[PDB]
């Protein structure tokens, strides 16, 4: 027999997980392979959470772990204690609603999988949308963190293939409320884009700069991610900005079903192999990982199952996701309405209406020429 534990938020989610695992067991042949699941709730103290999760799940000899973000607002502490504790061995952990760029460095987290587009897909879809707008004057504001640097690097490596000059870049630092010199730097330029990569409320600060440097209107479109249009940043924002957001975002039951289906497929694929051991139990008396640890992760990367709730749930080399979906809206007098549908190099935007943060409709052509020349010379009697 085998078991697949998980860490969920509420008891209703636990009941949904039980129903999903029962349905999965009802499927397939279920010959000599039974998977009864166990669940556990969250805790305020991270130390208590880590100790409890190891002593509970590890002692049960699980074969996979599912972790989801708790219902508490903001923050990102959801996977870090579980990922660190279960990262001692090579038991894979599946993410459910955790979209952060810190969990992409395989050197730090050596065993972590999820089915949610990191924020590299944010810059990828940014490049995909910008390839057709025909501006070639990319300038963006980036917060000095892991997410902002990752987004800027993804933009640079997306433009490296196209061989285009991305003007300049602005770095407004994290945790600041007085940013206007960067706005003056971006004031004089032929780059008519105000692409923004900030950290929530920080954007709000530079948003106030938009109300202070009077650059908004008849040009200077804005491009922000899903996290920049939530909270105060959404409230202290001007209309006409493109409300990019990731679409079935706050939905987990469908994601739970997809995860359990792909886990069952991977387990069935792995069962037909050579001798297989079991992960140790106790959290105390074992200091060695089992032999075929990374083998399960490797066979899990190459597991494709495009029949659960949505399209092809394909895992790339990084392990985040492939072929997901994106719904880019716009702040047209608030009430964001989807205008762009994205699924990977195959954008089919909605033709509802296009409005820019200048009260107009026509796309602001981002070009300036200037005939201001700056001759310089040294004196020379017959000529100068």
């Amino acid at each position, epitope marked *: 027999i085998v078991n697949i534990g998980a860490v969920l938020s509420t008891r209703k989610h636990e009941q949904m997980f039980r129903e999903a695992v029962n349905q999965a067991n009802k499927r397939h042949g279920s010959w000599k392979i039974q998977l009864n699941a166990t669940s556990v709730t969250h805790k305020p103290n991270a130390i208590q959470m880590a100790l409890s999760v190891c002593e509970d799940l590890i002692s049960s000899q699980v074969y996979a772990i599912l972790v989801s973000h708790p219902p508490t607002p903001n923050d990102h502490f959801t996977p870090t204690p579980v990922s660190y504790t279960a990262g001692f061995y090579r038991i894979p952990v599946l993410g459910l609603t955790t979209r952060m760029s810190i969990y992409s460095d395989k050197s730090i987290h050596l065993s972590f999988l999820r089915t949610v587009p990191p924020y590299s897909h944010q810059s990828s879809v940014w490049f995909e949308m910008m390839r057709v707008y025909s501006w070639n004057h990319i300038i963006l504001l980036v917060s000095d963190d892991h997410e902002g640097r990752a987004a800027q690097k993804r933009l640079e490596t997306l433009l490296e293939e196209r061989e285009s000059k991305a003007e300049k870049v602005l770095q407004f630092d994290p945790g600041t409320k007085n940013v206007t010199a960067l706005l003056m730097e971006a004031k004089e330029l032929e780059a008519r884009v105000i692409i923004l990569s900030a950290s929530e409320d920080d954007a709000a600060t530079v948003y106030r700069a938009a*109300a202070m440097l009077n650059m908004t209107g008849s040009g200077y479109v804005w491009l922000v991610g899903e996290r920049e249009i939530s*909270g*105060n940043a*959404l*409230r*202290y924002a*001007p209309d006409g900005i493109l409300g990019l957001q990731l679409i079935n975002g706050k939905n987990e039951s469908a994601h739970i079903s997809d995860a359990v289906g792909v886990v069952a497929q991977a387990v069935h694929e792995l069962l037909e192999k050579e001798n297989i051991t079991d992960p140790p139990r106790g959290c105390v008396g074992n200091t060695n990982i089992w032999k075929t640890g990374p083998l399960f992760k490797r066979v899990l990367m190459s597991s494709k199952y495009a029949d659960g709730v949505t399209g092809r749930v394909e895992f790339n080399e990084d392990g985040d996701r492939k072929f997901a979906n994106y719904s880019i809206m716009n702040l*047209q*007098r*608030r*009430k*964001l*309405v989807q205008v762009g549908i994205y699924n990977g190099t195959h954008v089919i935007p909605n033709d*509802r*209406k*296009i*409005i820019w943060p200048g*009260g*107009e*409709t026509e796309k602001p052509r981002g070009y300036q020429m200037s005939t201001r020349l700056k001759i310089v010379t040294i004196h020379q009697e017959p000529f100068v």
Partner: antibody
Amino acid sequence: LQLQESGPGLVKPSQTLSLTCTVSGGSISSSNWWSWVRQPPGKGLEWIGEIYHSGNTNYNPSLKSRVTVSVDKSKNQFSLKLTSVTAADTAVYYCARDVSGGVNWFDPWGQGTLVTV
Amino acid sequence: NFMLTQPHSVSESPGKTVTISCTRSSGSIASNYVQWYQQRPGSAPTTVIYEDNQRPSGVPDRFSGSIDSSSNSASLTISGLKTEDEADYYCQSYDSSTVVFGGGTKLTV
């Protein structure tokens, strides 16, 4: 800019009202919206929809397939149509354009039109 | 979508301070803006408070508005009540889905 709202005057049961809110002293060609405020008798106030010249309009998620608003710039006019208006749709319609500012703000408020279905 | 709650009725002597509280049951009214309108009997409503920090030009300086920021409620304070203040007070707010208006409160002199 002033708004003069005159309705069809017919309030028979199972009918659709289309009030004409003419604009005097102003031009339709602008970046402003024009929203309708629905006031039931002896109750509160709610917003049922709005019109904006350059394209899409958001009436309401509750009655998206029930209220349709169109605008003609040449006549400086804009009309609404409530699809399948029930006998309980007897209220007062007010046409207020907008305030730009940074968020929605209805000012000034027109005299509106009165319908008793 | 959400709802806003207002007191049924209030009574205060003229020349005193009258406080009207409009509470938001769902969510938190701390980032988006709220406004206070006033309706006369038989006339179109007129705004009295916007942006919770100033008043429209020509409005009396007695009217003031503030946000509790603790109980998700907006407080409108009028000092020096007068007979001309007899009207209907409404609280209006907006969100990312729809725009809602308060039930309304009436003060009796």
